[PDB]
Structure 1
Amino acid sequence: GSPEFAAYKVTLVTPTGNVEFQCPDDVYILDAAEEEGIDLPYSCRAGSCSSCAGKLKTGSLNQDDQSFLDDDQIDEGWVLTCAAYPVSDVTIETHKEEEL
């Protein structure tokens, strides 16, 4: 039932407004946002820090490539946007490092 290629609608709730774009299912959220000209926080780009943190509001992600968040944090909706792939349409609140 699965497509050979897919993308998903990403809605980012950023400090300067909501923005939306299609993200390939094999491109990380951060990278796809940047390709669309959206400036999001980051540092390591390796899944091992707090800089790119966001909160997942709607939908589902694959965060196998992240390491810094613990299992409880993942269960509570934390996202490292540099290391997350969408597996559905998603809504993510960005710029959330301060809440960790």
Structure 2
Amino acid sequence: SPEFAAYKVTLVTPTGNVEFQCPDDVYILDAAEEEGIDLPYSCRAGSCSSCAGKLKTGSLNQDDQSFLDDDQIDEGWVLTCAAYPVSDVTIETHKEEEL
């Protein structure tokens, strides 16, 4: 394993696909915001539905999330404020209305 790593995040947002590198120790939301992408949120603490997305491709660490149940994680749900990439990932954002 590397001392330092980042992963390519592809977000499929309502206004288009956007891509950026996300450090492996920065949450998806935080890294998107630093690149000027506006994503939904409210609690920023892993305990609500606001920042929900769907993982389409790759792997995440969501140890820091709590609101999604184990079946929802198995089904690909993501709380973007509380998720770290562990590989390159593609995530569809703005999926709250779907819960």
Q: Same-fold call, TM > 0.5?
A: yes
Count the aligned residue pairs: 99
Consecutive unaligned residues of structure 1, counting only runs of 5 or more, are none
Look up the match of 1:58: 57
Deviation at 1:50, TM superposition (A): 0.0
Cα deviations by residue, 1:29-80 (Å, 9 ceiling, x for unpaired) = 0000000000000000000000000000000000000000000000000000
Consecutive unaligned residues of structure 2, counting only runs of 5 or more, are none
Runs of 4+ in 1 over 4 A off after TM superposition: none
Deviation at 1:6, TM superposition (A): 0.0
Deviation at 1:14, TM superposition (A): 0.1
The percent of aligned pairs where both chains have the same amino acid is: 100
Look up the match of 1:48: 47
SS in 2 for 1:50: coil
Deviation at 1:10, TM superposition (A): 0.0
Tell me how far apart the structure 2 counterparts of residues 94 and 12 of structure 1 sit (CA, whole Å): 7
SS in 2 for 1:22: strand
Compute the RMSD of aligned alpha carbons: 0.1
Deviation at 1:17, TM superposition (A): 0.1
Deviation at 1:21, TM superposition (A): 0.0
SS in 2 for 1:11: strand
TM-score w.r.t. the length of structure 1 is 0.99
